[PDB]
């Protein structure tokens, strides 16, 4: 459930925030603050973007909320306090050389192997040996909140459960069962903690009551979670007895029920579709633009650092700095720079697939990251070719048209779906409709064209004792 969570006010697992933090931040009365960290500064800007308390990387956090603040009364005044963290070199075996190069080199290192984290030992040691650090933990934070628990190391789950058991700080952890990875942290919890309450979301929970509900309707495993509404605002049917402009101007103009003023998604299963609608709509004076499927939409391992490479590459107004907050941890911007020079290599006249191979490889390997062959590949192909560049664009475009797959995992706020492009009657289409049903945060219109569909819809609803689940207009 959704607003039983929000009711919750201890330790609660969630298995897959903001929604979270909004709330205990308003109902809270007292002077105690909450923390938000994530692995990377992009979950953390997205988090602070939609809200005195802290929101940062879990390095970020350990460093200036415990590491800097307190070492000299931890070790002593020989430990420097204006030390710089450095992820790339300055790696090391043992706790004690790494306290060696913090001490004598003024710089905060790693583990070189991965799964020991120095930054997370260091402030566990140093919060068991400094009352001040202790007590500032125990007076400034009720709650801390986590995000991709199922990645955090065996020294990070040390550290947050100390917090817990000891300075009396709430943990509310959200994850799905990372170089650093011990998935047996999050299960652990999940299958024997007894100080937590635990909870299940399916993916669409992000979506509003309707949204979920009608998404929900067409899998016989969902159906169970249908809370079902005494009136439905936001899943709108429409027919398909006039033209997608008039279409699209009965749905802004004359019933209202879409803004065109805000974000406007069509989904299709097809370039050819996408070009048949734009052929209309851009001639009755719509402006939509389509988004092509590139080689890099698939769910490969980085395809995300991939995709901001070629952003970066492609658009000279786009900040290495965005691209950078893609990586996890919570790199300088000496480190970024680092980044960039490699990157940079790809910007030469006449690039080729063996230069930009080598800086692949270049840059991956400073990134301690292994490279699929096919991504690669994948990435060979947009760097030489200007006909997916649109889906890279920095531009910001209001109204879009996707390909379903285009689609996945990218969110928008008002979707447009066509019902004979699904035909889940025949078990058909399943993944796709529930992928399309569920881009849209706050309004989802269904193009009621397919009598199989509908029929099928009316099947389910009948079955279940179900009166509303579309608003038809």
């Known amino acids: 459930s959704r607003e039983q969570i929000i009711k919750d006010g201890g330790n609660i697992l969630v298995t897959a925030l903001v929604s979270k933090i909004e709330a205990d931040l308003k109902e809270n009365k007292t002077h105690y603050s909450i923390a938000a960290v994530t692995f990377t500064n992009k979950a953390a800007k997205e988090i602070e973007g939609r809200l005195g308390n802290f929101i940062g990387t879990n390095d970020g956090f350990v460093e ?11 070790f002593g005044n020989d430990y420097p306090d204006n030390f710089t963290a450095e992820y790339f070199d300055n790696q090391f075996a043992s706790y004690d050389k790494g306290l060696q190069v913090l001490k004598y080199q003024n710089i905060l290192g790693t583990y070189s192997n991965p799964k020991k984290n120095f930054k997370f030992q260091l402030a566990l040691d140093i919060l068991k040996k400094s009352l001040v650090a202790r007590q500032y933990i125990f007076s400034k934070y009720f709650k801390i909140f986590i995000d991709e628990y199922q990645d955090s190391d065996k020294d990070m789950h040390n550290l947050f459960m100390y917090l817990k058991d000891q300075l009396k700080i709430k943990l509310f952890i959200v994850g799905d069962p990372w170089r650093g990875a011990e998935p047996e942290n999050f299960n652990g919890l ?8 635990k909870y299940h979301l399916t993916s669409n929970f992000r979506c509003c009551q309707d949204i979920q509900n009608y998404s929900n309707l067409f899998n016989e ?5 249908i809370k079902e509404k005494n009136e439905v605002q936001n899943v709108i049917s429409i027919a398909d007895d006039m033209p997608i402009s008039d279409i699209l101007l009965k749905l802004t103009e004359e019933k209202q029920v879409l803004n065109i003023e805000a974000e406007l998604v069509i989904l299709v299963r097809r370039r050819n579709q996408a070009i048949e609608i734009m052929k209309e709509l851009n001639e009755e004076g719509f402006n939509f633009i ?13 395809a995300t650092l991939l995709k901001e490479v070629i952003k970066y590459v492609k658009n000279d107004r786009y900040s290495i700095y965005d691209l950078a907050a893609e990586i996890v941890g919570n790199l300088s911007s000496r480190e970024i720079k680092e980044i960039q020079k490699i990157i940079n290599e790809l910007l030469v006249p006449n690039i080729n697939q063996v230069l930009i191979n080598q ?15 096919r991504e690669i590949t994948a990435f060979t192909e947009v760097m030489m070719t200007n006909e997916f560049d649109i889906a890279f664009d920095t531009n910001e475009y209001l109204h879009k048209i996707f390909t379903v797959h285009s689609a996945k995992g990218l969110e928008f706020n008002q979707v447009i779906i066509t019902a004979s492009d699904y035909n889940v009657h025949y078990n058909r289409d399943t993944n796709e409709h529930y992928v399309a049903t569920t881009r849209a945060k706050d309004k989802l219109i269904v193009i009621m064209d397919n009598k199989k569909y509908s029929d099928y819809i009316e099947t389910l609803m009948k079955e279940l004792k179900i009166k509303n689940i579309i608003k038809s207009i």
């Open 64 to 74: 200036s909320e415990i590491i800097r603040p307190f070492i000299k009364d931890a």
């Open 190 to 197: 999940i299958e024997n903690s007894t100080d937590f309450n």
């Open 221 to 225: 495993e969902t159906r169970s979670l």
């Open 290 to 302: 389509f988004i092509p499927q590139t080689p890099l939409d698939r769910a490969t391992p980085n």
């Open 359 to 373: 800086v692949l490889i270049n840059l991956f390997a400073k990134l301690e990251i292994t490279l699929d062959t």
